[PDB]
Symmetry: D4
């Protein structure tokens, strides 16, 4: 495909570096952004949320695991575990919190926050890794009700998610995106 | 008109990005900066005040609504309301305060702070939206005497306004500007 | 409208400076790129063709008239006429050739090169202004068969036009664009 | 693999943009630069040769086909054919010469120039597409002995190839690279 | 003076580097751009003409003497004379032509080209230094009718001068500027 | 003078923007940095101290008066006074502290801190303007022993001053500089 | 040597400015990074640790002594001593802490933290200079158990060190590096 | 030495990249620019002359050998010889001319052009390598009276050399520099 409307919307909606990282990640997992365009938008959204999350809090509070190649990501995970003494997670997480000393798995869902958190928690099993779910509707849900960041940073993330939703809807792209998850 | 003295003064007085945003806003509302030059200076001044205001306080305390196209501005307004649960304002505001959780309408007047605040408050009706008026004389007036920012940030804004006034006066542009409002 | 597929395609297809100049031109003529999207793509295409044309030939062979505000454009036209002694054109042209000493009116058509050239020539009447028409199919037509530039520069322009056509077609935007002219 | 010596040598030997384009091309064809490192070096070398070749001659003499995604590459090929009237090649070429009006297939071999040219010519069949082979030893071979560029540009390319060879040899990487083709 | 309309027009009309060089030159000669504003515009115009002139022709055809501090300017003059064997001029010139091997004194006048050339030629006496006068009306006059540059470069300079004239006139600044010389 | 050793040392010792501001200030006061080189070094040192001082404390705690043209400097002074209600100083100060609400006059001396403070205090008379003197030996002295900034920022300034002293001494420039004040 | 695998790994592993500073330091001490490659990696690692350390804490808390030429480094040391009154250290340290008012000697070891600290403390004798040792295994050791920085900054440094270790190991470079110290 | 007047003059006289390359070259040959300052100025001058020389002529006419580390320089020399078939020079040259197919050894002397050319020619013996000597007085001398470049490029180089001479003289540095060779 030379180009879809979802792909053009993604390129005009997200920062170029985020788009390139999403393209690299999908191609690394044998996915084509030109064909799997809803997945493309999903990777971009998850990446941007991760970056805004890391931008919340102190200057070097978080180590960003997402947005790297899985080799480098696992290298940084091993280094964090071997210096802090934290259990090596079974699946690759999104961030590491040096303040709370724990890995963070970030989720962005078009369903109910409750469903996706249940899914992620069943996946990781190891309750050591903190979970934080955001929805496009504005709800959020974190392990032990410990939301890690300030209310204002989380509010910025939720506002951004709702803007993305409105933008997709105005282009008649939101319904397929919502049903795709 | 190939150029007026007010337009040249505006271009040498305000930052280029602020000038471009003011030009876009006026042209979006069917106004010509080359002809309506006092309005041009007014849009530039209001924009710069809004930006300095947002620069006061924390890094991401404010969401800037002014300086966008009204479509994007209303999109961001809808997102803020639908994530925070705040009443949708009848008229487009200037900022959103994530700390105090409220929209802000900024005003810059050449009259008395009292007159312009009365006008703006009669306009919005919805007392939910905070009002903050600055004058070129150095006075200020905010809803519930809650001035939102530090004294030093407000002082910077007032100093800038007085510098703009002096600069216009030295070019014999201040009298027409003052009588234009 | 918060966004159409033609608008997103335009933003991903053309350079940002060209997009901004097209937006300024349309808004100056009371047109909205968010609504009149085929016109948006047309202004961007015409602008890019003009810029590539000026980039053909010597370093400072051409004076670019298109892409300015009509006040500045007419100022430069008056200067060119009052220094070279060339007849002031009735309608604003696109370029001035210092080598051949003549104004150039560039056209890009989705119809037949012949039809659009007839239209432009009937418009200007003053045969002093050279006409050069390009089509999306790859044909071209210039006054007195004097094509001004090298074959290779014209070939680059025609290739670019055909790429734009293919890109629009793959997004199902080409048919409405073609029927819009 | 977290990293090989060939990969580190490639990253220190070639420009970053060339490295990124090679990585994209291999991943697009289901190849991993971290594992297939000799192929990695080969893609980087071929890309750099193509870019130097295009930099020979006039400013816009060549249209660069290599270094794009095959969708965009074939789009540009279709545009070139549909504007010039040239036969659509069966396989994607490397460049298009607007001066000589023909597609160019560039080859870089560690064997004898003669062997690789025979292979490429048997591949394309369509004698319309010009062939130009460079070797790491400094020899070259072009269709109809028409070498397209100046002697000095070709000399620059050959010098660069020999420098790459020496650099690989000093790191004991040249023998495996040579036997890999 | 905090600012005049001529000064604001100068700052919006000329490139910032040219403005800074003019300010430095005037202050070096005990002149204040804020007060002597017509002189300010004149220095900016003469500087821009000199730069466009040097930009005509080959890459390193001209050595630019104007726009330096007189110490460095005379140092470069001495070097040019002591390497080429050319007579040291009594007054500082504007350029040196390595092609024609001669110093150039550039003039921009609001009077008749003839008057100003007579004045400059009486000044230098040494007929070795070439003279080239431009007017705001579009006329030009060079020693021995040897105009040094192409017609197209000179045409660009004349067009620019006429644009400056129109811009000043639209702001009612041209009459005082014209009568000031 | 084409150049002294003090001037070359100044250009290699201080940041280029600081050098340009010092040159502008001296030329504005009819001083030549090429001749009055010890004064040149003194202006650069005073400027750098002022900038480091303003960089101490909060982001927008200080309004920088030094390093502007006296017209703009007095304009900003008038604005600060007319918005805060502070007495207009008889002589132009260096900074304004929005936190402590007072103007600051910074001094850098090669004599004893006590002598220079006595001189400055006799000069200003108006005890409203805070005084803060630094020496090249590392001593400091502020009005009412209120040193305004943290100990660490002042320590940075003193270290820088001593480095400047050592650098001048190693070039045999310090003795004349010390005796020049 | 035209290049080793350790040198290529160093160039791809560390920031270019850090690489250049390490090269300058070694060449200043008569060392060749192309030959003494384990020393090259060690200088780069020590430099990066010093820079991360200085980046911990306040904006201007630390004066960086390492990464300068020893002449400038000793000049800054003399200035710090002559302004704070601190004993001049016998050997050049790495940093100065303006908060704790003391020089810091940073060490990075592949042995046990205890051994290297004993060595450094025997070296300096003057107990005035604080010592802080990091290991590639993640341990650390500071004088008087006063670790100067936050736990999170130290954790970042330890994670980086372990990543460097893993990267060297994957290239079979870690064993020789470890045995080289 | 913390700094000499020759070193400060060198840093203010030559471009920073040229200064860094000269520093690297001297330190690579066990020379200290802070002590051997006349040699420092000589390396900078020779480097700048080489760069201006390479900038004469076509875009990629010359391969620059000077300004590299001798390992890379000899690598490029070997590549040039092994692709062109030119005799490997006994001593490292300065440039390679792809047009004339020969290595160039550039010299800059404070003596007579004749003496230094005799010295260089006795050194290389291999008459294959072209010699081109420039003097600070403005004379020049090339093998077989073949001066390779245009008269205007050579004139630019000679003018620059004379400017350097005047600048050194005004600082009383020229006599020691002249007697040092
Ligand atoms: C470190 C670097 C890239 C970072 C990605 C991340 C991006 C960051 C950029 C900031 C500035 N903002 C904010 C406004 C716009 C912008 O641009 N934000 C945050 C918000 C959106 C965004 O874009 N950050 C964080 C540190 C600095 C930086 O840039 N990444 C990518 C994955 C790992 C990582 O740390 N790296 C590291 C090596 C490869 C690379 O690219
Ligand atoms: C975000 C971006 C532009 C921002 C406008 C605003 C400008 C800001 C720039 C800062 C840096 N300073 C300060 C010194 C000079 C300067 O330059 N300030 C504040 C003071 C004056 C000024 O200029 N800000 C704030 C965030 C970063 C940024 O740049 N705007 C424009 C409207 C919406 C918005 O957020 N965006 C967003 C998309 C379009 C665009 O342009
Ligand atoms: C002069 C300046 C803008 C020019 C517009 C035009 C754009 C030019 C840019 C070049 C570089 N390339 C080529 C590769 C990508 C790129 O970027 N090209 C040509 C091809 C596409 C493109 O983009 N040119 C030509 C001169 C330099 C320049 O930039 N314009 C705008 C209208 C009038 C004008 O002269 N001006 C003048 C004042 C306002 C402004 O913006
Ligand atoms: C156009 C742009 C990238 C180009 C790639 C190519 C690179 C070019 C860069 C030049 C400058 N030099 C020379 C010195 C170092 C440097 O940097 N050279 C040539 C030599 C090595 C090199 O790097 N060129 C040529 C035009 C301008 C440009 O940059 N490409 C990539 C594939 C298609 C294409 O045209 N594009 C187009 C869209 C995506 C993108 O990236
Ligand atoms: C060399 C440098 C400055 C030059 C001044 C001159 C400016 C030149 C810039 C070009 C690019 N263009 C063209 C488009 C806009 C732009 O910017 N043009 C020419 C047209 C208008 C303009 O601006 N040139 C010529 C060489 C490169 C350069 O920049 N000058 C100043 C006096 C002496 C000199 O050679 N120098 C030298 C040392 C101090 C300094 O500043
Ligand atoms: C605002 C701007 C210039 C400022 C001068 C001052 C310089 C500042 C720069 C910072 C960054 N650092 C720090 C590291 C190196 C560097 O570069 N520091 C402080 C330390 C030395 C230095 O250089 N500041 C402060 C605000 C941002 C800025 O740049 N000035 C000049 C006089 C008035 C003024 O506010 N302005 C305003 C209009 C004209 C102009 O130039
Ligand atoms: C000051 C300057 C260079 C500094 C070196 C140091 C580098 C700093 C750069 C920052 C930004 N980050 C962080 C992200 C990537 C990056 O780039 N960090 C810290 C982490 C790694 C890194 O790179 N710092 C600190 C002040 C600003 C600066 O750049 N140095 C070199 C030795 C002395 C010194 O102060 N100087 C001073 C004169 C010569 C020179 O080069
Ligand atoms: C290629 C690159 C550096 C080059 C050095 C040389 C410098 C060139 C820069 C030009 C632009 N101008 C001209 C005006 C000011 C300026 O800046 N000129 C020529 C005149 C003075 C100057 O500075 N050139 C030539 C090609 C592009 C470039 O930059 N060198 C260094 C040695 C080998 C080499 O090719 N490389 C290559 C790898 C390392 C590196 O640094
Ligand atoms: C958005 C995405 C892929 N949705 C999803 O299906 O979840 C898969 C997942 C995987 C691991 C942990 C938790 C969930 C997602 N990916 C990750 C992620 O970590 N690595 C995937 C990198 C990638 C990117 C693009 N294509 C394939 C792979 C998330 O952490 C996350 O939250 N969402
Ligand atoms: C400076 C200005 C326009 N003066 C004014 O007449 O008030 C109109 C107003 C509108 C909404 C709320 C409150 C007041 C002004 N505009 C806004 C603003 O929000 N959107 C207007 C964008 C625009 C810019 C230029 N032209 C037309 C429209 C302000 O908020 C504000 O304070 N002042
Ligand atoms: C693409 C466009 C507008 N199509 C068209 O309808 O022709 C109108 C036209 C006008 C003058 C001469 C010849 C033709 C076009 N505009 C111009 C042009 O010069 N100024 C128009 C600036 C503008 C841009 C956007 N909206 C309104 C106005 C062309 O020269 C050209 O070729 N095409
Ligand atoms: C370094 C200097 C000039 N030494 C001095 O003789 O004091 C004169 C002075 C003037 C006003 C208040 C206090 C002292 C100095 N100048 C200023 C200053 O404000 N404006 C002078 C701008 C200038 C720059 C260069 N040349 C002439 C004028 C200082 O504030 C300061 O401390 N030192
Ligand atoms: C990594 C290194 C060199 N390993 C080491 O053998 O220690 C020598 C040392 C020297 C002084 C104090 C403490 C230890 C090291 N150098 C320094 C350092 O300060 N100046 C050396 C600059 C240099 C760089 C490269 N080659 C030669 C010299 C350290 O402070 C440190 O910790 N490690
Ligand atoms: C300016 C210099 C060093 N004067 C000189 O004594 O001549 C020595 C020489 C060497 C080879 C061929 C011809 C002459 C000079 N160096 C070179 C040069 O090539 N490599 C030297 C790199 C270097 C830089 C700094 N320190 C030590 C070595 C020249 O080519 C040249 O002309 N002058
Ligand atoms: Mn996740
Ligand atoms: Mn408002
Ligand atoms: Mn047209
Ligand atoms: Mn190929
Ligand atoms: Mn002149
Ligand atoms: Mn002061
Ligand atoms: Mn250390
Ligand atoms: Mn040489």
């Amino acid at each position: 495909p030379r180009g879809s409307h979802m792909e053009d919307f993604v390129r005009q909606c997200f920062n170029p570096m985020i788009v390139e990282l999403a393209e690299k990640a999908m191609k690394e997992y044998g996915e084509d952004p030109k064909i799997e365009t809803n997945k493309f938008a999903a990777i971009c959204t998850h990446l941007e949320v991760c970056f805004m999350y890391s931008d919340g809090g102190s200057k070097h509070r978080f180590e960003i695991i997402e947005g790297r190649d899985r080799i480098m990501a696992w290298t940084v995970v091993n280094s964090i575990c071997n210096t802090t003494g934290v259990e090596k997670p079974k699946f690759l997480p999104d961030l590491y919190d040096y303040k709370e000393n724990r890995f963070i798995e970030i989720g962005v869902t078009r369903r109910e926050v409750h469903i996706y958190y249940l899914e992620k928690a069943n996946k990781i099993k190891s309750e050591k890794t903190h979970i934080h779910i955001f929805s496009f509707t504005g709800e959020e849900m974190a392990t032990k009700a410990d939301y890690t960041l300030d209310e204002e940073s989380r509010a910025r993330i939720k506002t951004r998610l709702f803007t993305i939703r409105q933008e997709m809807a105005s282009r008649s792209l939101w319904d397929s995106f919502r049903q795709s998850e």
